[PDB]
Design a protein around this ligand. Structure first.
Ligand SMILES: Cc1cc(-c2cn(CC(=O)Nc3cc(N4CCOCC4)ncc3Cl)c3ncn(C)c(=O)c23)cc(C#N)c1O
Ligand SMILES: Cc1cc(-c2cn(CC(=O)Nc3cc(N4CCOCC4)ncc3Cl)c3ncn(C)c(=O)c23)cc(C#N)c1O
Ligand SMILES: [Cl-]
Ligand SMILES: [Cl-]
Ligand SMILES: [Cl-]
Lengths: 123, 123
């Protein structure tokens, strides 16, 4: 009898999900943020964001193919967070930290927000 | 910077499992002899050579129901489906052969190799 945990399995799943996203395979929503559109998998968005979890749990919104976010959100900040969702890697820089932080607050992504606070503390 | 979040992928996978448990955004039913299992095509493709082949095939990719070989043990399938969504594999002497054969059919090499390791440790 053995109960085995595969330590790299989740990362490899995420990599494959990102591969699918990159190829537009099984993507089921376009997120619109002012001057940019972004394609994604609803399930991944739900998995990574309190806002998207709330949006797509709502049966009136669950099957929408387009979601318009607040047009005051910085699209670059959104793009950085979308990339993070699919890779575990966060491209934080002095030139984007404030935008990433505010976007992560809006998306309800607490660990990123806290990481931004740590970046600010060390700056 | 590029900050790496070591627990992110695991947390995504567990949230996907929660969505599967609640039947949220599942898009396929897998039939194994008398038994049915709902899942997300994206996760199946991410975890299985067989499902990746099926859902990249022009003729099968838009199917909402996939019938597996009825010779597959549904318990074996359930164990592998749970593994896909959790990274945890329930292996014991009374299920090893069924799990291994199922993993071969599903084209899940790491699980097959782990089964061979279990045989080395126990035969
Ligand atoms: C991996 C990761 C996730 C989040 C992150 C994801 N969600 C949404 C979420 O939990 N969704 C689901 C929850 C559940 N359940 C079932 C019942 O039991 C508990 C909840 N089931 C399915 C789904 Cl899809 C968040 N909601 C709020 N806040 C503050 C967050 O931070 C996150 C943030 C970051 C960051 N940074 C991150 O890396
Ligand atoms: C995490 C995990 C995965 C597998 C596992 C998954 N796939 C399917 C697969 O590769 N899918 C994708 C591949 C690609 N790319 C694009 C760029 O070029 C390279 C291929 N893009 C998107 C997807 Cl979805 C497998 N196919 C064959 N064989 C033998 C396997 O073992 C697996 C098995 C196990 C186990 N056990 C496991 O834990
Ligand atoms: Cl909308
Ligand atoms: Cl971490
Ligand atoms: Cl046993």
């Amino acid at each position: 009898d053995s109960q085995i945990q595969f330590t790299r399995h989740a990362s490899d799943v995420l990599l494959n999900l990102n591969r699918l996203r990159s190829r537009d395979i099984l993507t089921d929503v376009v997120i619109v943020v002012s001057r940019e559109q972004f394609r994604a998998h609803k399930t991944v968005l739900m998995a990574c964001s309190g806002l998207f979890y709330s949006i797509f749990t709502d049966q009136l919104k669950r099957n929408l193919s387009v979601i318009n976010l607040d047009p005051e959100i910085n699209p670059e900040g959104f793009n950085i967070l979308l990339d993070f969702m699919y890779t575990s890697r966060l491209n934080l820089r002095e030139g984007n930290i404030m935008a990433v932080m505010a976007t992560a607050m809006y998306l309800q992504m607490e660990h990123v927000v806290d990481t931004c606070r740590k970046f600010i503390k060390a700056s």
